[PDB]
């Protein structure tokens, strides 16, 4: 039960976004939700998707996590509009498409740093600004993939950006733990989303889960959202620096 | 919300048992609970502890997990008495004082195999018997410690037993996943219980957690119970073969 | 260069044994070698295989690692025959055939404990006895598989015994470190040997390595042997409690 | 024996550099060595240091790894001057001093990306250029630290850069494995070097190893160099995407 909680959900682009499965679950559990987006198209999609939620007010903020001032001012505006928050769900990554197929060793410096900036560093600065709204403690969760732990074909520069994110989670957990802020990751199995369309071989990744993972099926956004509700709530009070795989068991097999 | 769910909880000895933390949480959430014990003194404690619970009926079965027949007959009786179950919490381990409190390289064969048998093999046979009561699926959770992942001073034979149990969890997850049974572990931080008396230097282990773990505090049995509630319920659909550290973040630091 | 070093190699059965790859390499580097075996037939193979090696004398001892007396008396006799040794290569495991295929949840208690006894505990008692012949320090290496780290189809009871071995390696490393004895594992990739005939689906495991592993080829016993020379020698003096995968990179991908 | 092998060693600053331990070992084993340095100081210094080696000639190239041109042109020139190479030792990392103490959550975007660029991406572009000089295969080794696997006090931005670097090794292993180029890391224990002075609390880190690591002592640059010789030679054929801890066993304990 999350009535009287407030969470900031970063990274809804459309009805297939992982962050939207999180939103549906939290919403259904009674939470107040604030949404951040980059592209105008994503705000338009949030406005339509909010008609499916039970949020009596639209709280939408444009935050491009490449910009310190947009992250700083965005959270400062959120604090002014809704007061203190209980957590942040971070569902944000980016890499140029030519870096999500072919040969990893041909990755450009600009593409490698782009992916690090948006997919990893953004959690650091978000945590720094979000903590200002969590004087009593809180919970920050980011979304990762098994390609941060193992080399997977095609995931290439984003695998190295997820390894960076997963370490970023541990270091933030150590730093913010004395402030009663927990920081954790969910390592989601493959899910058809707008960003999946850029990963080479994505359909064969999905098929392999169905054939080989312990549950012999793929997961969906709402399953990620249910684990998010656990990590964002008091149920997980003793848990920080942790990476929970929501992937039908695929992480545990070879 | 666990109304209309039934769970078997194995390994309450007294009010400090981790499994009683689990019981309290599941009870508060509306579950029907069934309890298994070894020593007659454990049954007496269970009888006194059930007064604190909302359980309208006492469902108590003696199962020494060294005996196949006791596990077989105990789960069969549980089925005839309460019907199908939704999961099992396994909170059982044992090792001799004499092997524990000597150099690891001095561990006796008998003591090594005793600790495997009770602390690891018991999950396998329990899973096999409990699956007969879970025709539509279920969840099985066992309780481990960071000593199964790293060599910790003094934990000695029980660290090898915990590594065995953590691998047992992954193999059971692979085997039983197509039956929609999930199998997971909770890696609890140190907690003062009857069995902790067995571990040398236990007080300095507690003190290290306070000084060094991200949350700068120790965890308690109810925190283990809240993560158990997540693992045993539909909130962790899609999570199997996982090991969730309820340990203030200690696993993530060095 | 291992002239003036002496190593005990445990677990040659025939010319395909992983331990015979280790023997050839160590022999080619000038080490003096002592061999232990269980079955008469293995002693006969060792007698034949020694004609290929540069050892000027056969040091052969029957040690069934299920027997404490055989391990104690065998190492005692080794020390009386060749003096102090520089390390031990352990290449011993066993499980009953029915436990290397089908459903893990059906594993018998006696089969689970049998595999633990031979494949894990044996290392502990061997280290205890071998330490008496290494008063200046030494190196002990055991042979594991990725199935001890992940659930692998069919490997079943041996995967849990290997997770146990791997923890045994870390706990021995911690215990024996102050005596200047290093203890490490090599995680070998699949290799056609007599014991491979017990693993269901073995040929499929081999084909997956050629298709998926970074080197796109399988490894052989001599490559294990070369990593064994590294771990048994001063070249690895800083390295203990480690598990080195000699598996064409397969451990690193998913 | 590395006679008739040529290795490029990147990252000698002075007599305490880890890469100078590597050079000593490879030089002694008969390898021809080429050296790269960033700033002038490291030149002058290199010129002097190399009188301690048996290199008949001084092959020194200025390469600042922030510059694509310098990496591309530097490897090109090494190929013209010396011909094909057998491997590359990468011993290069950098972060701003302020980012190696205090609160990780305060790290600037500029500081985080600088550490990623120099300490992780540099391996990718180095590997791409160096491949051109390894048409029959070779071996690339980078130097990492346990702070890339766990959150360590103070190490902060560099911990996230080393996590990135360790994933970089695996993705390069997968990519370059079919060209018979292996890529691996050495995770060195703490060692007093010029870069160590920047790391907050370094002396406390060192003391902890002596007190708690299995070998109860610290490691040195030459021990890193001996494991580098293993990784760079045919002894480690079959080993790729691996991270070998030369740290007195500290990684294996908690
Ligand atoms: N789909 C999967 O199988 C899978 C599996 C594991 C993990 N993940 C992770 O889950 C997360 C969500 O991805 P998704 O699959 O749900 O795809 P998605 O719907 O495309 O979500 C990606 C989000 O990233 C945002 N974003 C990119 N750059 C940004 C920037 N500079 N500033 C602020 N927002 C930015 C996008 O916003 P705009 O569209 O407004 O630009 C979009 O809302 C990502 O971290 C992804 O790596 C996905
Ligand atoms: N305390 C901690 O710091 C800690 C941390 C991580 C993990 N754990 C784990 O948590 C679990 C519970 O331990 P605890 O600390 O709660 O100690 P506990 O209160 O002493 O519970 C241990 C239980 O194991 C049972 N048991 C032992 N052998 C048995 C057998 N042959 N058949 C049936 N039951 C048997 C005992 O039953 P009887 O008394 O009836 O014999 C007792 O109920 C164990 O797996 C333990 O390793 C403990
Ligand atoms: N082949 C692979 O793909 C692979 C991969 C990774 C790891 N491994 C491991 O490598 C090691 C060697 O196996 P292998 O593949 O080389 O097969 P192998 O040639 O069949 O060697 C197995 C050895 O185990 C010995 N052994 C079994 N029980 C024993 C006992 N009670 N006491 C003394 N020795 C006993 C056997 O001796 P007797 O025949 O005399 O009984 C035999 O010499 C094992 O630990 C295995 O798990 C194998
Ligand atoms: N010492 C330790 O305890 C320890 C432990 C684990 C891992 N490591 C790692 O070992 C490696 C070597 O460090 P070290 O401790 O040997 O210290 P070091 O002697 O200071 O070596 C660091 C080297 O990095 C070079 N470097 C920095 N930025 C560069 C750039 N942009 N282009 C080219 N070179 C650049 C420096 O060259 P200039 O001096 O010319 O600036 C210096 O030679 C690093 O990867 C470090 O993280 C060190
Ligand atoms: C293979 C599974 C997967 C993982 C992801 O991280 C993912 O999301 C991204 C992948 C690449 C770039 N930006 C993203 F958001 C999509 C995906 F489909
Ligand atoms: C150090 C933390 C800890 C872990 C345990 O597994 C634990 O439980 C046991 C420890 C040893 C033997 N039987 C047990 F049940 C107690 C403990 F105190
Ligand atoms: C699949 C790879 C593999 C691993 C082994 O541990 C192995 O060796 C055994 C496998 C099962 C039982 N005893 C053994 F010695 C054979 C093998 F082929
Ligand atoms: C704590 C151990 C350690 C690790 C390092 O990576 C290290 O080297 C650097 C540390 C930080 C920045 N640049 C470096 F080269 C020094 C160090 F002393
Ligand atoms: N190479 C295709 C992969 C097709 C698939 O999803 O399997 C792509 O670039 O998406
Ligand atoms: N070895 C002591 C432990 C002392 C402590 O708790 O620190 C014991 O017998 O329990
Ligand atoms: N020689 C193979 C025969 C494979 C087959 O034809 O069954 C064996 O050892 O089983
Ligand atoms: N079921 C066969 C598998 C055939 C193979 O792939 O080796 C076995 O038991 O060996």
- Mind telling me the CATH class of chain A? Alpha Beta
Largest interface: A-D, 40 and 40 residues
Oligomeric state of the chains present here? homotetramer
Molecules bound to protein: NADP nicotinamide-adenine-dinucleotide phosphate, 5-ethyl-4-fluoro-2-[(2-fluoropyridin-3-yl)oxy]phenol, glutamic acid
PDB class: oxidoreductase
Keywords: oxidoreductase, short-chain dehydrogenase/reductase superfamily, fatty acid biosynthesis, lipid synthesis, safabi, fabi
Assembly: tetrameric
Entry title: Crystal structure of S. aureus FabI in complex with NADP and 5-ethyl- 4-fluoro-2-((2-fluoropyridin-3-yl)oxy)phenol
Keyword list:
fatty acid biosynthesis; homotetramer; alpha/beta; oxidoreductase; globular; Rossmann fold; binds NADP nicotinamide-adenine-dinucleotide phosphate; binds 5-ethyl-4-fluoro-2-[(2-fluoropyridin-3-yl)oxy]phenol; seven-stranded parallel beta sheet; short-chain dehydrogenase/reductase superfamily; binds glutamic acid
Structure explained in plain terms:
The structure is a homotetramer of 254-residue chains. In chain A, 41% of the residues lie in helices and 15% in strands. By secondary structure, chain A is an alpha/beta fold. The first copy, chain A, has one domain (1-254): NAD(P)-binding Rossmann-like Domain (Rossmann fold, 3-Layer(aba) Sandwich), CATH 3.40.50.720. A seven-stranded parallel beta sheet of chain A has the order 3-2-1-4-5-6-7, sandwiched between helices. In chain A, strand 4 (87-90), helix 4 (109-130) and strand 5 form a beta-alpha-beta unit. Chains in contact: A-B, A-C, A-D, B-C, B-D, C-D. One 5-ethyl-4-fluoro-2-[(2-fluoropyridin-3-yl)oxy]phenol binds at residues 93-95, 100, 145, 155, 158, 190, 195-196, 198-199, 202, 205 of chain D.
């Amino acid at each position: 039960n999350l009535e009287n909680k407030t969470y900031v959900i970063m990274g809804i682009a459309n009805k297939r976004s992982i962050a939207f499965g999180v939103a549906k679950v939290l919403d259904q559990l009674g939470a107040k939700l604030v949404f951040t987006y980059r592209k105008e198209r994503s705000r338009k999609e949030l406005e339509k998707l909010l008609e499916q939620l039970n949020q009596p007010e639209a709280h939408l903020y444009q935050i491009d996590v490449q910009s310190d001032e947009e992250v700083i001012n965005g959270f400062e505006q959120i604090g002014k509009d809704v007061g203190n928050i209980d957590g942040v769900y971070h569902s944000i990554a980016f890499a140029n498409m030519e870096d999500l197929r072919g040969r990893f060793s041909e990755t450009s410096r600009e593409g490698f740093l782009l992916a690090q900036d948006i997919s990893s560093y953004s959690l650091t600065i978000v945590a720094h600004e979000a903590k200002k709204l969590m004087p009593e403690g809180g919970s920050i969760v980011a979304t990762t993939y098994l390609g941060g732990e193992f080399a997977v074909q095609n995931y290439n520069v984003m695998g190295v950006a997820k390894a960076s994110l997963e370490a970023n989670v541990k270091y933030l957990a150590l730093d913010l733990g004395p402030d009663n802020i927990r920081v954790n990751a969910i390592s989601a199995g493959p899910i058809r989303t707008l960003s999946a369309k850029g990963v080479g071989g994505f359909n064969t990744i999905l098929k392999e889960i169905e054939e080989r993972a312990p549950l012999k099926r793929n997961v969906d956004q709402v399953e990620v959202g249910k684990t998010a509700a656990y990590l964002l709530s008091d149920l997980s009070s003793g848990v920080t620096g942790e990476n929970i795989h929501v992937d039908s068991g695929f992480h545990a097999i070879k």
